[PDB]
């Protein structure tokens, strides 16, 4: 599991992508013009992640065209409620759609585990790609976000919701 890394500038600030031949491990937010990854080339999961992020931010109408890379962070290597939540989220909630913590918990097999779902949103090593920003409050409120409220709102505004893109 030879770990390789590359960084990509984005509207949300610098993104550190890490992964190996087997899959992408993590997308880390370190804090208008499309940028390239600082280090080009494989492993394949990294190149796929870079193309997906570029499309997400700069060619969103075509986001469904880009393959989601294989994931190899340990959380995906074992069976757990967190993994089920993360995989369910990735599969069901599309660009522009939202789901409540409770609906995701129901989707993951336990309608009463909304709090566990919230915690799982932070155990998410690959934000944006696995759209944890689309998990919101049943009240209509945006809700918490590991990377800060402003980022969640920026992403939701980017996906068509009636929120203004905050200053980031
Ligand atoms: Zn790996």
UniProtKB/Swiss-Prot annotation:
Biological-process GO terms, alphabetical: DNA alkylation repair; DNA repair; methylation; negative regulation of apoptotic process; positive regulation of double-strand break repair
- What happens when you mutate residue 101 to A? Decreases activity towards methylated DNA over 1000-fold. Slightly reduced reactivity with O6-benzylguanine
Q: Name one GO cellular component term.
A: nucleus
Q: What is its EC number?
A: 2.1.1.63
Q: Which reaction does it catalyse?
A: a 6-O-methyl-2'-deoxyguanosine in DNA + L-cysteinyl-[protein] = S-methyl-L-cysteinyl-[protein] + a 2'-deoxyguanosine in DNA; a 4-O-methyl-thymidine in DNA + L-cysteinyl-[protein] = a thymidine in DNA + S-methyl-L-cysteinyl-[protein]
Job of this protein: Involved in the cellular defense against the biological effects of O6-methylguanine (O6-MeG) and O4-methylthymine (O4-MeT) in DNA. Repairs the methylated nucleobase in DNA by stoichiometrically transferring the methyl group to a cysteine residue in the enzyme. This is a suicide reaction: the enzyme is irreversibly inactivated.
Protein's recorded name: Methylated-DNA--protein-cysteine methyltransferase
Q: Source species, please?
A: Homo sapiens
Q: Gene encoding this chain?
A: MGMT
